[PDB]
Symmetry: C3
Subunit: 289 residues, 3 copies
């Protein structure tokens, strides 16, 4: 069995003083197609592989290709995956819940480098032998994530730096907890990052959360992000503030809205201010097919 | 929802004195696959995106990839599209109705340069930031086309040349009219081209038309094409003659046949003579799946 | 109509002293997707085209693309195909029946060069104009294969070397015969190879065969391969020995197992010894979706 899913999204992307001779506002857009092949068995074991074809405005050659394969085996809630795998740091909950706009962005996201699912190919050749192993398990309420990544599996281990990450989240009807730890993130020695987050669903239509990060060797340093959103029926209001230890940095913040036009169609917009006092705004549509 | 459609076609392509050391006749063939994702809503609005993977004999690397995405929104007969869009000049009626053979060709087609849907990627990098906006509307019988194209949307407007094109066609049961105008066609300054065409369906199985072109900065100059076809049940006979103002040019002409083998399978052939006295012939099959 | 089929496979690949500074064991894996478009007619004729997207661990750019198209027409058991076609030498029976492991390998396979379906693109540019014609016909029990391949169809014939191959196999319930002949294999002049094989199904769960090869200009020389397998319900045991005329060569051999975990899921493993005394072992899974 092979199924095809994906999405499209487009709108206006603005960034003040984007560059001399350059247009501040452009029409950013993206097309994503996921190709998933699965083989189910009566022994209760599922085999699957997926491939992704994704194009973005600006992409080289005005072309679209597939990325590197991912394979997995699920059984009794346990899933082992190989190849181009999702990572623990990128997989945990709450960590990206401050994002807004149609391009789902936020300076409130972690400011560190770490491996995460590669959607496109890479011309540099850097990923040619990038292979990983990931494991997840859901013990009702609790979620476990373990990922191991070798940027070049053909070379003798001791010669390369592997990334290892552990992560877990839990959640009842009103409180949520999440923690994650990754050593040698992004294959960079001593680049040990960490996340700890908590959220409170102070109602059905609203939630306030707090994320704290240890950005490893990032010049950003430790960082805390405070966000919240509220749902007035079909439209959602979002806001957040973020701070990093880097000297002289500005407090990052953003305010935005979501409008569920229909099932599958979502209109979003936002205005954000980065740590270097950058100003960015967006408004677009996203449709899932 | 994601649907896959497309077609295949192959046969013999002949061109007299194709080049020293080169074979005049080769087996030309093409595979085209369209990937269309759509999201319908009960509000009566449709969202969609499409991608194309097309290979042609001769293609570099003996490979096939996807091109740059196209997105659109339809509502009440009005459709707005973004990205790799169809253009007014390329979209109007009658303009390509003189073509024949399995590769659908004719020296009777307009001899000017202008933007039109890009089916493949482009290694030059020329299309990396090529973005367009197109609008069409059907007021029963009449068809409106408007397209705006910026070959590099990242650069400040005033620095690049955009193509703008308007076009409209109308048609009852026996008469058809079509006109089109595009300024700075193909992004070339002062390259303003125009088309005007009329056709008469002098019966159910036959039609005679006349197309006049203003090829902008093309050395071809103004051009008039006269074509006609007749259907004897399953086989269609086609013919045409074309003239351009370029000095010393030859009158272009071609005679060909279509044979509807089945629904979806079409056999075609033709012999044509170009303005530079080139001789070309073809015979092949085309199947839509 | 367009259908999507394919498979995924992964496991451990071992090869003793794979190279200085290199890891002997790696996780080899593959994803294959076949895109097939067909157009059926009530005249009893079928038109089709297929494309392949296949990724392998190690692939450049960590990307995946499509290869060069193949088209065909089937009628009354006769099938004519064009473009990237399957060849007679690669298509006959018994010739690859000694292979084992999840990567289906065997030093017992023919040691000659010859054209065969190209699954991926080729950066060298070598296949840009590689076009072929193949014909097969099944006269109940007997199978005929004819293939003609021109590595560069644009160039004048006399300037390039074409590969031509004939092949046929037959088979009742317990005996099987197969022969094949290809001249200028792989487009190499005087590289005439041949195969002759016979197999006996000495039971429902077992088979012993013998393949003899004339490897044309290969330094391997003539070669004979002896293989056999036995099925104990769900697990299959395989073994083989191979010899070539090349001076000082070692006798190649391998022993392996297959385990049909479910319909579509197959676990395999093997240990093999090459003619140059190479040691290789593998164990993996393959799932068809």
């Amino acid at each position: 069995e092979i199924s095809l899913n994906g999405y499209g999204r487009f709108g206006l992307q603005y960034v003040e003083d984007r560059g001399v001779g350059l247009e501040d506002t452009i029409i950013s857009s993206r097309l994503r197609i996921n190709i998933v092949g699965t083989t189910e068995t009566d022994q209760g074991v599922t085999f699957g592989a997926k491939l992704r074809m994704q194009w973005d405005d600006g992409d080289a050659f005005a072309g679209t290709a597939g990325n590197a394969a991912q394979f997995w085996t699920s059984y009794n809630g346990v899933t082992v995956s190989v190849g181009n795998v999702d990572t623990a740091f990128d997989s945990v909950a709450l960590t990206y819940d401050s994002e807004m706009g149609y391009e789902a962005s936020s300076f409130g996201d972690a400011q560190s480098s770490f491996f995460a699912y590669n959607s496109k190919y890479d011309a540099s050749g850097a990923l040619d032998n990038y292979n990983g192993i990931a494991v997840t398990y859901s013990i009702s309420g609790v979620n476990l994530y373990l990922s191991y990544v070798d940027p070049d599996q053909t070379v003798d281990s001791s010669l390369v730096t592997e990334e290892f990450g552990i992560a877990a989240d839990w959640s009842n009807d009103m409180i949520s907890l999440a923690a994650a730890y990754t050593t040698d993130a992004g294959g960079i020695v001593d680049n040990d990052i960490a996340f700890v987050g908590a959220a409170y669903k102070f109602n059905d239509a609203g939630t306030v959360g707090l994320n704290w990060y240890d950005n490893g060797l990032s010049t950003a340093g430790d960082q805390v992000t405070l966000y919240g959103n509220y749902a007035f029926g079909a439209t959602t209001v979002r806001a957040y503030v973020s701070d990093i230890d880097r000297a002289g940095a500005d407090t990052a913040y953003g305010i935005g809205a979501d409008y569920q036009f229909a099932e599958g169609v979502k209109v979003s917009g936002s205005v954000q201010s980065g740590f270097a006092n950058e100003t960015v705004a967006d408004v677009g549509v996203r449709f899932d097919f």
